[PDB]
């Protein structure tokens, strides 16, 4: 407090004899008064130091900062100016003089002169762009010319996302340079860091309208009007994606009703040009965004029945699936990934996965939708829910559409497997999109195509890394990214389960649409993913490379289950299970051995943690964890039997996949699970396939028949245990009927071997 | 004809295969490898000039090539320090709202100065640089001094 | 910095005012390096890498 | 180059250039049309060029 600074300065001015030695402590005395907010006592003690040390730039800078905290602009500037005179290395203080002059007087030739000096010390600086902008808007018509040349010449360096591109388009539109405004949009839209802004897309959509509102009946304009409507419908579809994701329900209505109005003006152009092609695809995006708006209404509308919103949303996704994918001929020169192919695959992925999240666990569900709503009553119920009955249906795209020519076909999973491989190109490997697809596939019995997606996004990586107890970015493989995404999906799925453990409805989807599903992954999971992407694709900005490396080198300890990893036991089981089920699902010894190798790595990290819980000890949680612990999956004291069975089964599977067959047989015959019996049957059937039947000895033929007998007599045990206990069928990795398909074969393979 | 003018003919590929190994996110690793390439050829040329009979006028180019690549080596060393500091400072300057302690010693005023002051920090990187040149000219020799 | 921040007491001798009163800049050092009588330094301060070293330091 | 050699009465040098053009090339110029968002013949410089190479062969 003041009184402690006063007591210290009293005893320190007692322990000082001469006046000049008291002044020589004045800098120190002044800082202590400033740290009590005693600003005039700070001023009084720094001036009584300066009057004994006229040439310290730090004492002058401290007196300037005290005048800045007294709003005394030119005295702050004069003490800063004097500090620049006494040490010219202070580039920062040259810029701080330009701040406090342009914030005092915009006409001041000193403001313009100190900005001149700041620019000549920091080119490419948004703080210096902003201090020029503030002078040149005040230089009038003579200002406007200089402001145009400034905007062009400092855009050409790429600071400043969003702002300067909107301010340029304002200045074109106010001067009625409308084709110049649209031509700037035609260049600026090539920047992905503008296409992500709601503000930019709002300006683009409104600039394209104001240009159409200036075109005429001329045969030039019959081409300009085509481009500008293709641009306008694509800009509406991206603005609608952003508005669904970032704004309210009513903000989403008024935009969708504006997009409906812009489809209705193009709808007359029955033809075969790229506006005819864009219009067809944009019917698909309109109904996808309308189905997204109905489920976004359900997310907030506390008094509304989820059936009516999800029925009208299922109709919307059925239309948004059945809109045919563009039949492009992409040409042998154009390295441009076609936008209509990527947007059609993102549509067919999102509408297809949303149909399967709404039909889930029902019968005739898409037929409830078609027989009730694929008609002009359903067309009204859809319009009167989306827009309300305040506008005409005759003047609307939706209100005058067809929705009667509809198919009843559910989305085929191999078609989705090919549309995700387009959607992930549109989303550039975004973790929110990869987690969203992961949760849709985690609603099905088949595994997500993560290996397809990762070898598409990171094709310069090895699949495994022979250095698992290391954390360097130079040792990353696909399996660290596969494990990472499996953990982001798992921790997102449990944080959906535990929301649905309240008031969930059979007409509410378990996963909401991508433009409606709030953030799934943590900013730490994302900060690792975005840093991995930025390092591998070498987008790493200078200096920041070191921060990105240190962050990436933090979570590789976590992911590979290294020293003090802090993971939940059930997440390490889920990683072992998913890699085991993926490894055996591949026609490749090298892939099997890498996948099952990484599964066995996690099982050999699980067995120690189980041997904490089997004593009724807890495990230490991280205060911030990369993957959350969840008490709705914390391992119970009984399950520590099965998580000590399946671990050794997975060792015997890896060691069979090593060629360690007699170790693996000994392991399986010691474990005596039905999963062990199935791997014994496969090992002994393979030991009849590895006998080349072109004139064998009777000794080789009788060991072959003894392998077929060992196979038969282990396939039988799987029937014995399964009709003795109908739970055992749920550890079996195949249909019980395919145990009988193989057993019938292995009996024919023994009885045909007996008529000679 | 000079050996030095024949021996340094690789460095135009060697710098290229070093550039095509790196990126804008490994742009200092590139200059540290450029110093290792120049320092390797300075080592080779020194291991030729130290074997020339004094006054054999052919080795004039070998000695000029040694000094040229020795001054190049330390100019890559200079670049690898000063442009690292200047990029780190330009990424930290939004953050450092420091406060001095009432009870600080000379050491901890200077521990604060070398954070506060890029002119003092870059001036010491020139001292460290110039002291490293004199160090590399001393090498193994300290224990060969008869008194 | 030390004699601005570390308030010593009862010390009655000065460090020389030619060194305490020294204004420094990087440009100045590379003018003083061109005012020197040492002819060697004046010839080395004209060769290609010593010129690059001045400009990289600035 | 064949137009230059034929006008220069260098019929064998024109035949040396005719052998530098591989005999698949007329069909390869159609292969490069049908895959990728072109027309039914390869463009109007190249239809005329195939017609000209067929004149030179004749």
What are the b/e assignments for A517-532, b being 16+ CB within 10 Å? Answer: beebbbebbbbbbbbb
Distance of CA A257 to the CA centre of its chain: 29
CA distance B89 to B79: 16
Name chain C contacts of B106, Cβ cutoff 8 Å: 2, 6
Q: How many CB pairs under 8 A join A and B?
A: 34
Token pair listed for A337: 């990934």
- Are A487 and A627 in contact, with CB atoms under 8 Å apart? yes
Question: Alpha-carbon distance A535 to A528, whole Å?
Answer: 10
Which residues, in sequence order, are CB contacts of A574 under 8 Å at separation 6+? A486, A487, A490
Three-class SS of residue B99? coil
Which among B24, B26, B102 has the least Cβ separation from residue A32?
B102
Q: SS3 for A654? A: helix
Residue pair B86/B133 in contact by the 8 Å Cβ criterion: no
3-state helix, strand, coil in chain B (%, to 5): 75, 0, 25
Locus of tokens 């959906």: A496
Choose among C4, C9, C23: nearest Cβ to A27.
Answer: C4
Whether A460 and chain B come into contact, CB under 8 Å, resolves to no
Q: Gaps after which residues in chain A, C–N over 2.5 Å?
A: none
Contacts of C49 in chain B (CB under 8 A): 68, 71-72, 74-75
Distance of residue D23 Cα from the nearest chain A Cα, in angstroms: 21
Q: Which stretches of A208-296 are assigned E, i.e. beta strand?
A: none
With CB atoms and an 8 Å threshold, state whether A55 touches C4.
no
- For residues A720 and A726, the answer to whether their CB atoms sit within 8 Å is no
Token pair, residue A326, equals 């563009």
Q: What is the DSSP letter of C37?
A: S
| Cα B129 versus chain centre, distance | 7
Spell C3-26 as b/e; 16+ CB within 10 A means b.
Answer: ebbebeeeeeeeeeeeeeeeeeee
Q: How far apart are CA A430 and CA B62, in angstroms?
A: 57
**Which secondary structure element, helix H or strand E, spans residue C24, and what is its range?**
none
- Cβ contact C57–B82 (<8 Å): yes
**CB-CB neighbors (< 8 A) of B119 in chain C:** 26
Residue A448 makes CB contacts below 8 A (sequence gap 6+) with A437, A438, A441, A442, A489
* Chains near A (3 or more Cβ pairs under 8 Å): B, C, D
Residue A200 contacts residue A243 (beta carbons within 8 Å):
no
C-alpha A232/C-alpha A52 separation (Å) is 70
Q: CB count, 10 Å around CB of A459? A: 8
Count, in order, helices (H) and strands (E) of chain B: 6, 0
Q: How far apart, in whole angstroms, are the C-alpha atoms of residue D57 and residue D1?
A: 14
The CA-CA-CA angle for residues A227, A230, A235, to 5°, reads 120
Burial track A184-220 (b if 16+ CB lie within 10 A, e otherwise): bbeebbeeeebeebbebbbbbbbbbeebbeeeeeeee
Distances in whole angstroms, Cα of residue A668 to Cα of each of A603, A673, A676: 17, 8, 5
* Cα(B20)–Cα(A652) distance, integer angstroms: 45
DSSP run (H or E) holding D50 = helix D44-57
Angstrom distance (rounded) from CA A343 to CA A285: 8
Which residues on A lie below 8 Å from C9 (Cβ)? 15-16, 21
- Interface check for A32 against chain B (CB to CB < 8 A): the answer is yes
Separation of alpha carbons A307 and D52, rounded Å: 70
Cα separation, C55 vs C53, in Å, equals: 6
The neighbours of chain D, by the rule of 3 or more Cβ pairs under 8 Å, are A
CB of A176 closer than 8 Å to CB of A203: no
For residue A736, what are the contacts with CB-CB under 8 A and spacing of at least 6?
A718, A719, A722, A729
CA nearest neighbour of A85 among A56, A106, A112, A127: A56
Measure the CA–CA gap between A42 and A28, rounded to whole angstroms: 9
Q: What is the C-alpha to C-alpha distance for residues B2 and B60, in angstroms, rounded to an integer?
A: 8
Q: Could you tell me the CA-to-CA distances from B89 to A92, A541, A648, B20, B115 in Å, in that order?
A: 12, 14, 54, 28, 9
Inter-chain touch A331–D32, beta carbons under 8 Å: no
Radius of gyration of chain A (CA): 35
Q: Do A17 and C10 touch (CB under 8 A)?
A: yes
Reduced to 3 states (helix: H, G, I; strand: E, B; else coil), residue C1 is coil
Method in brief:
cryo-EM
Distance CA A354, CA A668 (A): 43
Please state, in angstroms and rounded to a whole number, the distance separating the CA atoms of residues A603 and A583.
15
Q: Of B109, B120, B126, which has the smallest distance from its Cβ to C6's Cβ?
A: B109
């Amino acid at each position: 407090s003041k009184a402690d600074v006063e007591r210290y300065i009293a005893s320190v001015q007692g322990s000082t004899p001469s006046p000049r030695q008291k002044s020589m402590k004045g800098f120190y005395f002044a800082k202590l008064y400033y740290e009590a907010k005693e600003y005039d006592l700070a001023k009084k003690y720094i001036c009584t130091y300066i009057n004994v040390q006229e040439r310290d730039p730090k004492a002058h800078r401290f007196l300037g900062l005290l005048y800045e905290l007294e709003e005394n602009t030119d005295k702050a500037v004069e003490c800063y100016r004097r500090s620049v005179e006494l040490n010219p290395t202070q580039k920062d203080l040259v810029l701080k003089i330009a701040e406090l002059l342009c914030k005092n007087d915009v006409t001041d030739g000193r403001a313009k002169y100190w900005l001149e000096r700041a620019a000549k010390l920091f080119p490419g600086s948004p703080a210096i762009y902003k201090l020029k902008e503030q002078l040149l808007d005040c230089e009038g018509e003579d200002g406007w010319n200089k402001l145009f040349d400034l905007i062009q010449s400092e855009l050409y360096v790429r600071p400043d996302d969003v702002h300067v591109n909107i301010r340029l388009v304002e200045v074109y539109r106010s001067t009625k340079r409308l084709k110049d405004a649209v031509a700037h949009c035609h260049e600026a839209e090539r920047n992905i860091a503008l296409r992500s802004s709601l503000e930019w897309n709002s300006c683009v959509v409104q600039t394209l309208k104001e240009y159409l509102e200036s075109l005429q009946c001329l045969e030039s304009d019959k081409s300009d009007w085509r481009a500008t409507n293709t641009d306008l419908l694509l800009a509406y579809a991206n603005l609608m994606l952003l508005t669904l994701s970032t704004r309210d329900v009513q903000e989403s209505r008024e935009l969708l009703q504006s997009f409906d109005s812009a489809l209705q003006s193009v709808k007359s152009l029955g033809g075969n040009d790229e506006l005819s092609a864009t219009f067809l695809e944009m019917k698909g995006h309109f109904y996808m965004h309308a189905g997204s708006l109905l489920l976004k209404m359900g997310q907030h509308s506390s008094n509304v029945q989820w059936r009516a919103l999800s029925e009208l949303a299922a109709l919307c996704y059925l239309i948004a699936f059945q809109v045919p994918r563009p039949k492009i001929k992409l040409i042998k020169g154009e390295a441009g990934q076609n936008l209509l192919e990527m947007m059609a695959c993102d549509r067919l992925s999102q509408s297809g996965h949303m149909l399967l999240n709404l039909s889930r666990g029902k019968q005739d569900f898409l037929k409830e939708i078609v027989e009730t709503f694929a008609n002009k009553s359903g067309q009204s119920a859809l319009y009167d829910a989306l827009f309300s009955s305040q506008s005409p249906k005759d003047t609307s795209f939706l209100g005058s559409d067809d929705i009667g020519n509809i198919d009843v076909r559910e989305p085929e999973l191999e078609d989705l497997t090919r549309y995700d491989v387009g959607a992930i190109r549109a989303h550039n490997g975004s973790l929110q999109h990869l987690t969203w697809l992961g949760l849709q596939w985690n609603s099905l019995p088949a595994l997500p195509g993560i290996r397809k997606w990762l070898k598409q996004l990171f094709h310069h990586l090895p699949h495994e890394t022979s250095r698992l107890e290391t954390n360097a970015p130079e040792s990353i493989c696909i399996l660290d990214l596969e494990v990472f995404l499996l953990g982001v999906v798992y921790t997102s799925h449990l944080q959906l389960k535990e929301k649905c453990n309240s008031h969930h409805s059979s007409y509410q989807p378990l996963c909401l649409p991508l433009p409606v599903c709030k953030q799934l992954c943590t900013e730490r999971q994302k900060s690792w993913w975005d840093a991995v992407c930025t390092l591998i694709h070498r987008k790493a900005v200078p200096g920041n490379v070191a921060k990105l490396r240190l962050l990436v080198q933090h979570e590789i300890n976590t992911l590979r289950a290294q020293e003090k990893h802090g993971l939940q036991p059930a997440l390490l089981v889920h990683w072992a299970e998913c890699l085991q089920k993926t490894g055996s699902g591949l026609n490749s010894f090298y892939d099997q051995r890498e996948y099952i190798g990484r599964s066995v790595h996690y099982w050999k990290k699980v067995l120690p943690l189980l041997k904490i819980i089997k004593k009724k000890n807890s495990i230490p949680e991280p205060i911030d964890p990369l993957f959350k612990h969840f008490h709705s999956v914390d391992i119970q004291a009984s399950e520590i039997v099965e998580y000590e069975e399946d671990a050794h089964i997975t060792f015997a599977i890896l060691d069979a996949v090593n060629g360690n067959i007699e170790d693996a047989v000994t392991a399986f015959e010691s474990i005596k699970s039905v999963v062990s019996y199935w791997n014994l049957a496969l090992i002994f059937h393979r030991k009849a396939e590895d006998i080349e039947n072109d004139a064998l000895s009777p000794e080789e033929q009788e060991e072959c028949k003894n392998y077929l007998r060992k196979t038969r007599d282990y396939l039988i045990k799987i029937i014995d245990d399964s009709d003795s206990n109908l739970s055992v069928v749920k550890k079996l990795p195949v249909p019980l009927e395919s145990v009988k398909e193989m057993l019938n074969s292995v009996m024919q393979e023994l009885e045909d071997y007996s008529e000679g | 004809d000079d050996p030095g003018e024949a021996a340094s003919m690789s460095m135009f590929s060697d710098f290229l295969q070093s550039f095509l190994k790196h990126s804008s996110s490994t742009v200092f690793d590139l200059v540290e490898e450029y110093e290792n390439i120049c320092g390797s050829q300075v080592n080779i040329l020194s291991k030729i000039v130290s074997r020339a009979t004094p006054g054999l006028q052919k080795f004039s180019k070998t000695a000029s090539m040694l000094w040229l690549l020795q001054q190049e080596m330390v100019t890559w060393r200079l670049l690898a320090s000063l442009y690292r500091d200047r990029i780190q400072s330009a990424l930290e300057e939004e953050s450092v709202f420091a406060v001095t302690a009432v009870n600080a010693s000379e050491k901890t005023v200077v521990e604060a100065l070398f954070q506060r002051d890029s002119l003092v920090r870059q001036s010491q990187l020139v001292v460290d640089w110039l002291e490293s040149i004199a160090k590399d000219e001393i090498g193994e020799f300290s224990d060969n001094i008869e008194f | 910095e030390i004699q601005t921040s570390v308030a010593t007491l009862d010390e009655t001798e000065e460090l020389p005012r030619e060194y305490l009163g020294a204004n420094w800049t990087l440009e100045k050092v590379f003018e003083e390096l061109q005012a020197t009588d040492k002819k060697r330094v004046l010839e080395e301060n004209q060769e290609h890498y010593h010129i690059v070293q001045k400009f990289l330091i600035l | 180059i064949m137009r230059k050699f034929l006008a220069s009465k260098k019929h064998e040098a024109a035949k040396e250039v005719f052998v530098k053009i591989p005999q698949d090339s007329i069909a390869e110029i159609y292969n490069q049309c049908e895959e990728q968002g072109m027309e039914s013949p390869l463009p109007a410089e190249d239809d005329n060029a195939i017609r000209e190479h067929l004149c030179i062969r004749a």
